[model samples]
Target: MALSEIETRHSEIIKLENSIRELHDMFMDMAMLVESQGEMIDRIEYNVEHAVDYVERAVSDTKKAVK
Candidate 1:
């Protein structure tokens, strides 16, 4: 009975360790995905800023023409 209990406990520990490893791997994948998406956000923001700059230049040109 004692040996059986020890074997069962060992098996449970192994299963728990495996689960923890899987969770860690998933977390790493999520971190990588976030990093990739963060770069896209920066690129999108840069384009939006450029668009704003163009609009500003257009407004300035129009004002100058009116004057």
Candidate 2:
């Protein structure tokens, strides 16, 4: 291949590599957010069970309504 053609291909490959890296970083950020949300949900569930009766009442009411 000609030098110019090789240079063009090299530049294209570099651009694609950069795009892949950016996508990887975005995936990492999204995964971290989901992990944090899961932890928050666990805490909310624990609180609902042990800290108050409101959640239990609401769930019971909803079940009765659905019946």
Choose the strongest candidate by TM-score.
Answer: 1
- lDDT, residue 46, model 1: 100
Candidate 2, superposed: residue stretches over 4 Å from native = 51-67
Locate the minimum summed-lDDT window of 10 residues in model 1. 1-10
**What digit string (tens of lDDT, one per residue) describes model 1 on residues 1-67?**
6999999999999999999999999999999999999999999999999999999999999999999
Model 1 CA lDDT for position 64: 98
Q: Write the per-residue lDDT of candidate 2 for residues 1-67, one digit (tens) a residue.
A: 7999999999999999999999999999999999999999999999877756887788999999999
Which stretches of candidate 1 lie above 4 Å from their native place? none
Root-mean-square deviation of each candidate, in angstroms?
1.4, 6.7
Clashing pairs in 1: none
Q: For model 2, which pairs clash?
A: none
Best-fitting candidate, scored by lDDT: 1
